[PDB]
Amino acid sequence: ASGFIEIANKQGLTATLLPFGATLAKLTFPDKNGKNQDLVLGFDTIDEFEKDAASIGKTVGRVANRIKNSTLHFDGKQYTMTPNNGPHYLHGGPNGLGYRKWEVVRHAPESVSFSVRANEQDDGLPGDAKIDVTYTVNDRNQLIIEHHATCDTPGLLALTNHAYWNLDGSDTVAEHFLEMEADEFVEVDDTFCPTGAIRSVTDTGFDFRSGKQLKESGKDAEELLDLDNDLVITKKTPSTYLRFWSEKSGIELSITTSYPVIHLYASKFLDCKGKKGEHYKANKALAIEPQFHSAAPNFDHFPDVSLRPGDHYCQEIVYTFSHVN
After folding, report:
1. What value, to the nearest 5°, has the Cα angle with vertex 315 and ends 15 and 112?
2. For the domain that residue 93 is a member of, what is the CATH number?
3. Contact 215, 204 (CB under 8 A)
4. Which of 52, 190, 237, 266 is the most exposed, having the fewest neighbouring CB atoms within 10 Å of its CB?
């Protein structure tokens, strides 16, 4: 058996990790009323996490999101996996990184690092890789997630963190405000698999450039937010890219990442017994997943996510917690 690992700074920021799936189990931070609030969904027990299928707080890999039709071409060779989500291959498959027990290579009062190895035999994806993920909290009230990796054999590697966020405990995050520096988004089909097209956010329900409440996303016949797309980060050349907050709890979350996109999932298909024995329902939280474009391995015009011998996969996500004053 394993066990929850806790890290924390000196200002009231605590994070609880789990070796299994290198998961972010909990993240507590005092609200405007000085009351501690767990900002991420989860489970009160370890086994519940090992049985979860919604990838709650997990470190996802080797390839986050979908591989169109469970097939791809790598270095002139075709790789075909067994579908695990519709006709596609989602989050690295049933034996993806999120479903494996990572080794604890470092643990200190404010930081913890996990490591794990994966090759074609483990998940059917090309080559192999030694992956190391670190969670660190600091005096700036930031949670830093570092994603590092190397390989002996050429393959693909595109990770992300699948934590579902809810800053005030509300039944849903429809009232939460969201602001993103994203001019474009990745188009997806009915099965939510990228089509390879990029669409401007202008005049669409995905324009969060002015900061609005999530409840504002068109008008469907289910009154549910079906957010679950890749929002391409507008990055300069010659900084915070996302701000998520709740006027209710007064808690705000800002993010900066090396990744080119941030996948936002409004938790439309959620329905599980979480913390406090609570019953999570539709649009309960907001999954924020900094990552490379979904289905990158299927479209050559999307970022090249190959990881080859001698190179170093190195990405980071910085979450800053504060208050809206």
Report:
1. 30
2. 2.70.98.10
3. no
4. 237
Structure solved via = X-ray
In eight-state DSSP terms, residue 47 is H
**Helices marked H in 235-277 — which ranges?**
none
Bridge partner residues of 112 (DSSP): 107, 135
Active site residues: 162, 289
Resolution in A: 1.9
Query: Hey, what are 202's tokens?
Result: 């202008």
Which stretch of DSSP H or E encloses residue 260?
A: none
Q: Where are the alpha helices (DSSP H) in the chain?
A: 46-51, 120-123
Q: Which two tokens stand for residue 144?
A: 């830093």
CA distance 233 to 230: 9
Interruption sites in the chain after residues (C→N beyond 2.5 Å): 238
Going from the C-alpha of 44 to that of each of 3, 18, 110, 140, 269, the distances in angstroms are 12, 12, 22, 28, 21
- Output b/e per residue, 202-219; b: 16+ Cβ within 10 A: eeeebbbeeeeebeebee
| Full residue range of the structural domain in which residue 322 is found | 1-325
CA distance 273 to 49: 11
Q: How far is CA 203 from CA 121, 176, 216, in A?
A: 46, 21, 13
Contact 168, 251 (CB under 8 A): yes
- Calculate the alpha carbon distances from 167 to 37, 102, 182, 226, 249 in Å: 7, 28, 22, 19, 7
